Subunit: 341 residues, 4 copies
């Protein structure tokens, strides 16, 4: 019965903890610690009150022992006691004391294989970097696709990105059935926590601009990450992302060149079958006239909007929605649950 | 000189009149009447104050004369005296007595050949439908591409849409140089007037949804319209539009298969060259990391963002911005100006 | 028990029906009919999918029995079967046939005593106008304040407005304990369905302006409505509303002159004591550092934010939140429930 | 001429530089240096492209002479050569060499007398802190009210806040005419650069919350600041600020108890006369139904909205708009100009 810790109690970290309590299936592992540079009182406040996902439907108590700070959290007839830490430098964390089996690295600041190793030094056995790899990882994993390819010897793992976890299924499903010559991705994405309120100095001159006022083209880490999960598609895939002023939920627009005959009907039927069989854990398809809000708090890795499917000659476009926060958080727990032996 | 009337004093109609006063170049025609179902005081207020384009830099006085209502408008060293009408039925408009050469039909309600002809019945010599054709038109015109083909028998002209005026040049330039087998268009567009503030009954169930809260995929009239200007593109292009919570400015994302070798470098050089020569009146290209608000109040039909160009194999993506209100308005003025030398 | 109909399935009508299913209290009456000008498929879609309140957690099945349309709705262990009408004129509705005890009039168009009685002609026994009075009503009711005052002969009742149901308790509690010489109200309010997406002709020149871009001061009906509930406050109170770009939830800021000694502590203690006793059904008090989204889907008529209370000399300001949709809907259900024997 | 430096090239600093170029009448002093922690290319990009105020109508060329970085800026028939620094510690800046007469302190981080004096150590003869006094200042100045009270020996000056520069004139004008017993302010203010895009750890739990999604009550420095400027009003005035999802422009809502007879007419007439006589430089009054975006890029410290004025008994509300960025930036330049140039 494994022991998970979360480093970085932000949009992803907090949602991982909520999704644990809200899941209709109880997970076999326990989350037993969290860390963030903010104090516990700020953390509990933000865990309880969320502008995107609403009030946490449960009870949180804070316990100060002589040394340690704990949360006692109850919801949906489940209970966790969760040590809270406030240590900026992940090597100085007490992962050995706490017997931590997996650390979920959700800060965005420790994606290098070196930085992820800091958690290995502090005592943890295994790290899931919750982002695209910066350089080296023992594996890059998309739950529902290649999670069985985790070797019990692998110690630094990447759960890639929200975008990746939606792209890879699409690419795999379509490449297996029709063959993909090349494809280009357009992602339309809600604002993210690293953007700016008003125009302000920032590393990226596009993300420096007022996030509430602009359509903002930007890079996606998803293409680099898809190469690692499917090296057979090197040089065959590119794309980018566009930030717009919604609070949550994203869509992927994938345009590809088929290597065999295609119709709108054949593509949709294939995606329906995939969703009903081999991918039913992470994938759904709808034909209802829905918009982004309707997928807020959806646990799926992608939801294909089949009415958007288009074909001209050898070229086609498919479209899928996903909750970039709730889908990924759920896939993190699904991944941790897959290590059970 | 020519005598222009404007039917429907909305986003487009008001921006047409504003752009006449703001144009660096005076036009060789006059706007002599406007018609709306709204009261003159409402129209003058909205003409003077605009949430998108700022205050009209000028003065407006209402006078009554012979029981007719006029606006006297002074700005940028020009004055217009403009009759104001309030007739919901085009056939009952006094175009014959006003000696109207051109009606700009900007209501959205009279796009059919028969409906547009009502202005002809009322005595105007020529209508421009400020929208895509519904059924039939004498001619579908994109200024700077095929405005020279207008013949004196073309009485009902469609100036198509914002999107078509950006898409048609892109397709043409690229098809002429490299050849397009097929292409798919994704437009990312600011909210439009016909959308909803909150979820509300509406003919279209996606545009029924709260416009400030959602990413909303919907149809685009632009592909139908492009096919009327370039019939050879039938069955070779398709696309769709996405509404997002910004007030103004749109982007087109065009994905195509080239029929000859492409690189990013070569595509960009072609588009730059086009912008300097044959399409200098309507088209610019930038290489700066810009966002939508940077194009607000730009008069160009399109501004290629050369930093977004991508190529994999035979497949490319190009990206261009436009102010969907100010570009189109200026193109309506340009079209009228071309009607007599 | 008792049989209710809803005329107008908009933000209010739809949320009344949702709130029926969601209420922890089960109500001893049934909604047996809805009427809108829109078709049933649009209505069901909007009932199921909401940008503000999320997906309805339940199922709807549309059946045709006779030539009558019905919704079979199941949620929260509860079930209703509701006839669906599409009649634009209330006198033509089948209320006598259906044996309607109470019509909830939620269109906004039949607020006058004459228009409302059309339901009574059509066969309904009692109408509740879900809006401030236009001219005369038999009674103007704030649930939890003066609902005991409904006479069995009262046939045309007004449940006033969301703003009125926050304001009246506040004014009453404070005037009763300390005395209010005069007071002024500033409401800060989310956008409402009658506002504009872009600058558009509108009867109100302020509400003509782009609702996602602007702070928009406008009128509030709550002052007239309050004066019908409390005629003593004629000439002693005024105020206005400011619309800002949020989707739901509002706040009242009430500045009053006290007729007797006041402190922050004493005002807060009073409001707390009222919330715990005579007003526990409709009122809460918090001292947590919360924001508007934290009150979305709150059923309270008002939640006082005690940290905002200020006193200078004889002048004070109190501040209360409310979900302007969900509070009002629940108060409508509470009012209907109060009519039982 | 007099020689000014800007410390902190953000929303205020950048607008100060733009306002220099845009002012119809040329200022007779020059801005010769800017310092920020961000790289010069980021600074020049943000200076040229602004989501709120549009593109700079000018050209900027970056030059390296010696080991010094210079901005050569040309706009509106005016030229400046501006050294760019990147020194986080103000004691280390080369103000002695540059013979700086006045440093505009626009970072928000150096508001204490000791912090501001670091600029004096570096050789600057005078500092204007562009914010409320933190501990002590030689003078707290509202331009147009008490800028004449500056002494030649005053070295650390506060120009207070945008809010204070609107509040003080109102309080003063109304107090001088009718007498204010007490007053309470509500400010409705656009989002600021220190807020959050999504729910995020922050020192302040309300400003932690998604700024595009929420109404957020918070504190204002203006009340403390007004006390420094007008000591007689100790114990007579309080208030607070509310952040809402617009990008720029704020309003003051001021409720006061008057010590002599008042009417709406008399209050408005007073404010109009004040604006035409003693306050013409900094104040305007409108009687048209305007909204926030109509004041974007307005240089006034306050524009009174005479249609909002209300009176009940001895109590009154007045309402004023201001562009929080452009007003304050203009007032900084005017205060510098008041020292002679
Ligand atoms: N938000 C999404 O939609 C999404 C989806 C998939 C993956 N991701 C990835 O998740 C990661 C985090 O993103 P987020 O949206 O949760 O951002 P966030 O800013 O909400 O979370 C970052 C958190 O880390 C904390 N923190 C900062 N420095 C720290 C340190 N030294 N030690 C510990 N905690 C520290 C912050 O206080 C904060 O709570 C990134 O790699 C991001 O790319 C995000
Ligand atoms: N705004 C854009 O981005 C854009 C770009 C290109 C084309 N268009 C097209 O322009 C047309 C108008 O769109 P808009 O954005 O100006 O919309 P709008 O709703 O702002 O304009 C419609 C106007 O027509 C008036 N009107 C309605 N019925 C009338 C009647 N019977 N007679 C006279 N006036 C009447 C209304 O009062 C309103 O002023 C549409 O066909 C639209 O597709 C819009
Ligand atoms: N939403 C709020 O915050 C709030 C709170 C209190 C009171 N109110 C009041 O309630 C009323 C309705 O407001 P709303 O927000 O629900 O508006 P809405 O526009 O969302 O709903 C109006 C509904 O009435 C329907 N309708 C129109 N004409 C009809 C007819 N002849 N017969 C039947 N149905 C018809 C429309 O199709 C629509 O579904 C207004 O008077 C409003 O001021 C609103
Ligand atoms: N924006 C408004 O409406 C407004 C109005 C009145 C007063 N103010 C005040 O003006 C100040 C600045 O606010 P702003 O809106 O310009 O914010 P901002 O964040 O846009 O500007 C701050 C700037 O300072 C720079 N900076 C940070 N640390 C620095 C350092 N050590 N040395 C030099 N430069 C450094 C940052 O890179 C940034 O460019 C604050 O005190 C604010 O309250 C703001
Ligand atoms: Mg909106």
């Amino acid at each position: 019965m494994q022991r998970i810790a979360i480093n970085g109690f932000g949009r992803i970290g907090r949602n991982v903890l909520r999704a644990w309590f809200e899941s209709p299936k109880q997970f076999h592992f326990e989350i037993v610690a969290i860390n963030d540079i903010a104090d516990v009182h700020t953390l509990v406040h933000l865990f309880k009150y969320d502008s995107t996902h609403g009030r946490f439907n449960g009870k949180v108590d804070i316990t100060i022992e002589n040394e340690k700070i704990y949360l006692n959290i109850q919801s949906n007839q489940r209970l966790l006691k969760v040590e809270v830490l406030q240590q900026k430098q992940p090597e100085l964390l007490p992962w050995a004391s706490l017997k931590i089996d997996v650390v979920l690295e959700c800060t965005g600041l420790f994606r290098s294989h070196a930085d992820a190793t800091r958690h290995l030094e502090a005592g943890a056995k295994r790290v899931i970097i919750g982002a695209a790899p910066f350089d080296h990882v023992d594996a890059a994993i998309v739950y529902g696709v290649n999670h069985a390819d985790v070797k019990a010897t692998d110690q630094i793992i990447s759960s890639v990105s929200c975008t990746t976890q939606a792209l890879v299924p699409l690419v795999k499903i379509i490449d297996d059935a029709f063959g993909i010559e090349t494809a280009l991705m357009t992602e339309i994405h809600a604002v993210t926590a690293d953007q700016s309120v008003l125009d302000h100095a920032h590393r990226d001159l596009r993300r420096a601009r007022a996030s509430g006022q602009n359509i903002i083209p930007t890079t996606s880490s998803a293409l680099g990450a898809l190469k690692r999960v499917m090296p057979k598609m090197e040089d065959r895939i590119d794309g980018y992302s566009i930030r717009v002023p919604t609070i949550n939920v994203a869509a992927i627009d994938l345009t590809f060149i088929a290597q065999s005959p295609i119709t709108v009907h054949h593509i949709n039927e294939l995606l329906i079958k995939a969703s009903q069989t081999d991918y039913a854990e992470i994938m759904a398809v709808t034909d209802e006239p829905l918009v982004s809000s309707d997928f807020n708090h959806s646990p799926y890795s992608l939801i294909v909007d089949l009415t958007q499917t288009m074909v001209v000659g050898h070229q086609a476009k498919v479209f899928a929605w996903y909750d970039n926060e709730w889908g990924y958080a759920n896939r993190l727990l699904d991944l941790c649950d897959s290590f059970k032996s």
